[PDB]
Design a protein around this ligand. Sequence first.
Ligand code: BJX
Ligand code: ATP
Ligand code: ADP
Ligand code: MG
Ligand code: MG
Length: 1171
Amino acid sequence: QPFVNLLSKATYWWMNTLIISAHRKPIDLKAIGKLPIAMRAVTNYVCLKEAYEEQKKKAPSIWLAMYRAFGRPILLSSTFRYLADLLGFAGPLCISGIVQRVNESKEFLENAHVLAVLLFLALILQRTFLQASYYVTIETGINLRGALLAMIYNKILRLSTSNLSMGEMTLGQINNLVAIETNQLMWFLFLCPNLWAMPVQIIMGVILLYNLLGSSALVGAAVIVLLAPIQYFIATKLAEAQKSTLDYSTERLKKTNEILKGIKLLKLYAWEHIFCKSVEETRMKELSSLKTFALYTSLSIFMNAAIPIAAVLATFVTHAYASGNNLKPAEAFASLSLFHILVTPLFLLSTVVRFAVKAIISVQKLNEFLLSDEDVAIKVTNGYFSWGSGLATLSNIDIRIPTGQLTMIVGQVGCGKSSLLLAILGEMQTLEGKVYWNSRYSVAYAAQKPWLLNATVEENITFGSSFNRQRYKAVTDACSLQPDIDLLPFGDQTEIGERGINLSGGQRQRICVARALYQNTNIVFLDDPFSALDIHLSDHLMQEGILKFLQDDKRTVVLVTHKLQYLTHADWIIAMKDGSVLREGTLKDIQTKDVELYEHWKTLMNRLRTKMPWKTCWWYLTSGGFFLLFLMIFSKLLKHSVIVAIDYWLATWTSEYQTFYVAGFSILCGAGIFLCLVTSLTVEWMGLTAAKNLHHNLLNKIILGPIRFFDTTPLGLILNRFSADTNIIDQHIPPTLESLTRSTLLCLSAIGMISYATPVFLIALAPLGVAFYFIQKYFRVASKDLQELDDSTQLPLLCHFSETAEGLTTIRAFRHETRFKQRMLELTDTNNIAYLFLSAANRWLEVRTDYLGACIVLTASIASISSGLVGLGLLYALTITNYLNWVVRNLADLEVQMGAVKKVNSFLTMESENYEGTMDPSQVPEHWPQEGEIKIHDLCVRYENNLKPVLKHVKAYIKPGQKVGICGRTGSGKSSLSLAFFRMVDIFDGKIVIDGIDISKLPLHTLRSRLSIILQDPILFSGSIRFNLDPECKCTDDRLWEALEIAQLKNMVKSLPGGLDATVTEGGENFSVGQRQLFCLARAFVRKSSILIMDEATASIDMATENILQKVVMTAFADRTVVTIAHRVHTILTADLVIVMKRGNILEYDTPESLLAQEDGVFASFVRADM
Ligand SMILES: CCOc1cc(CC(=O)N[C@@H](CC(C)C)c2ccccc2N2CCCCC2)ccc1C(=O)O
Ligand SMILES: Nc1ncnc2c1ncn2[C@@H]1O[C@H](COP(=O)(O)OP(=O)(O)OP(=O)(O)O)[C@@H](O)[C@H]1O
Ligand SMILES: Nc1ncnc2c1ncn2[C@@H]1O[C@H](COP(=O)(O)OP(=O)(O)O)[C@@H](O)[C@H]1O
Ligand SMILES: [Mg+2]
Ligand SMILES: [Mg+2]
């Protein structure tokens, strides 16, 4: 009975139920059993950590720990591999025996049928052992992958966060370790038994070949063995080319992500075309590298499929012209079978050695990484904290935060404000002075830089807490997100953060503040919650979010803002400057003790089944051009015909049992070499052409789309169309298609030859055909499904790792390390289950196909028994066993990847906007905004069809060169009205007349080129400062410098390294918010347009900076007309005409003095609120 369990485990019957069935119902993690307690990431991690700790006590090297953790399975797998290899070497011997016995006490052992039965049994045993080895090694490799992921995740949680240690590039290295390093180490562990087996297989094969064919065997073995060093050389060249391609791909991906993450600015500036051209240039560089890589892949395939032919040629010619006897058929076919046996190990030994080198470097990298550095609410005495480099960033720190009372700390930009919080949390290094709390309890913390979980908004706000409707609603209302969440595609469940629907900086800050408030933890550390928020939003938030909501819960609050106007509410105040606290006390106490501090603060105030998708497959094939497809298919057909002809020529030559045969064989070998060369070249060329043709139009169409598409569709899918799908099309498909074609042709040729040799074989072909059809049918669905699960469950794993390495401070301030560890384990287990069952399906198919092939070998042999043709048939029967499962697996992979091609193709057909317009090209003036006049008539605007009109028949006219400022409550249509001039939002009724031309009829690019707009949150694109100032590069440097002076950034630019070409980090992160805003103003200036639209430009600007910016703008653009959306009404007091928007209506339209004249005026009330 237990032998039945052993057979079930050897034949992977334990998964037949989930393969034969579960094609009707898709395979889901519910269907797949949870991982056995033995293989869970927890157990593997504890084992590997125990081994590593034993080593560390002995000291530690990761290799010895890995051995002590996963030796026994690897020894078992190597034993299985050796048994499989030895049994497999019984093929050629059996063929030789059968052939010799045919056509005319150990007598029984010589009987032909006995040899046939022995061959069949040996084949089934070899395949069973080989697949058992594969599965044991795969299982051990996946266990190791789980352990390593858990280990590096624990290290990530225990990181240091100092910029000396972590800096900014370290996150990239951490993501690399989680993604590529661990996978490469896992794959080395997958393939390691090859290092044990392949050299021994080569040795045994060459020994048998010598025993069969004297010195000719030595000659052939030398020629063949020359295939290992050549393969290693070509593999090195391929690795170099693929590293270059990877670098160019990462560059292109960063450029694309920048383009489609700030698409609104590009479209408004009409820069989309320039950035797309730059991305296309990077694509051309990537395609040059990819063409080199494809050329070397073609040469690798050529060598793989040719050097064996040259070796056979040398062996047999040397035997013919050296060996006295002729070529007995048995010897010839045994030699051919041995060469077929040795072709795979030699072509793969170079790959396993390269994998071993990559694993050694990966383990060195991991070893390097693991050593990376690591009434009174709170009391600090003689605090002295350092970031790690030994320099005392904070000195003489002594604070006392009252419990249950609001505390605010104030200082200059860069006065040890944000660092003090991290020091309190322990992230900093405590040189001297202990910190004593009421060991620490969880403390809610909203980092200065907002951090967002990729999960939905509801999850981010809740953040692992007991979802309570009342508290959730109260927080969301206090945070002013109730209408903003409704705006997003899903009211309460839309994706957020990287790889989700992008949000404005204000929205991110609001989400983070909501998360901090929602938690029940008593201590709360808020760091610049108002920086991104508008003035109205901040006022609303503090009026009740801080003063009411928190005080209702009697929670200690530590708010870090430079907005002094709210100091009146502070119960305790701490002044920090130059890393030292000026004083700590109440407002009145501080003022009495420090009159100078009060004066400084006042001055600062200044006041069901899915079939194979043939259609997409055919479209991909024809993408290269019908001629290229015809050349590929015809060349492959001719190549395989010539190879079969070589084998048949050998068969006839043996049956003859000489100079006339030598010449024929040599000529056919030459033809085979040439046709292999041609076939490889053509297939790779078709692959390259298809990749280029798809990607070019893909990117062009995506950029040409409409804004709402980016507004709703998550950025994850859009950027996945370029990151993974294009990678698949460029690299994975062409190889898979080539493998499929070659394997199908070889299988068909073998079937044909076997049938020709023994036409009776066709009788047994039918049951074998049916069995193969059923195996193909069931596997091609089970695989597809399991790969779907693997990818869909591997996305969240890397998302979790990335979002953990990001915002360590939040994780360790909430003290939610354990919960995140548990989630990491629960995700890595799921991913490993999916991958493990994918490999189990592969083993299932391989074993069933190997038994099918063993049946084929048995039937072909039995037919042959009842003179060289028998040997030829047996040889091809043996090769069918090798090639059948590869046909099936390549077909499955081709289907899966053509799915990605289909996705890209569907994205290739998308809506757009009528850039052409209708106005006469000659009609437009040379300088259209010459006068700058603006006139409107009953304008009506709606963001999307069937939605509520944002603007309600607003009618307005601006005289040339006038200056008008617009204000109003949030969601009153200010931003939409500003964007109206650019037709970023559809207009139902009314029109906008500028310079006597209705914009509606103008070409979109022409309209959006001659207008200058400054968004609320400034975004600056990576590249040179010149590039940001004018990508078209059509401005003399003098204009750039004049603009920089106008922006007041001339001094900073001069201080820049290159001055005029200083490097700019992605998104303008290099500079400050004020510097970025000034640079955006300069960007607007260079356009030399007469109309400027400032949509809440100075939201993050300070009072003095805002005033100086406004005055310099007015002086510089005195002639030009400007429309400004006022962040604060006080900024637009000196305006020619004032407009206030309320619920999409311009209630007030008159001069600022006239508007202020009205009693209880809305604007007048706003001014009082600001004051
Ligand atoms: C994730 C599973 O991956 C496997 C992993 C294994 C373990 C293994 O010794 N591979 C040998 C192949 C054998 C036939 C020589 C090998 C060696 C060098 C380079 C690639 C490869 N192989 C890479 C995978 C498939 C192509 C040849 C077996 C089989 C598989 C499999 O696909 O089922
Ligand atoms: N994590 C860090 N890595 C490297 N240098 C740091 C780090 N944190 C602080 N510093 C340096 O130590 C000093 C203290 O920073 P401080 O607390 O003043 O930042 P902050 O000005 O409060 O934050 P922000 O300017 O974003 O409001 C600064 O001069 C800063 O450059
Ligand atoms: N992308 C969008 N899709 C649909 N409606 C939008 C979109 N953006 C804004 N709105 C709607 O337009 C109104 C005004 O928004 P907006 O002009 O952006 O802010 P403001 O009120 O500051 O002008 C809001 O009530 C909002 O619901
Ligand atoms: Mg800060
Ligand atoms: Mg707005």
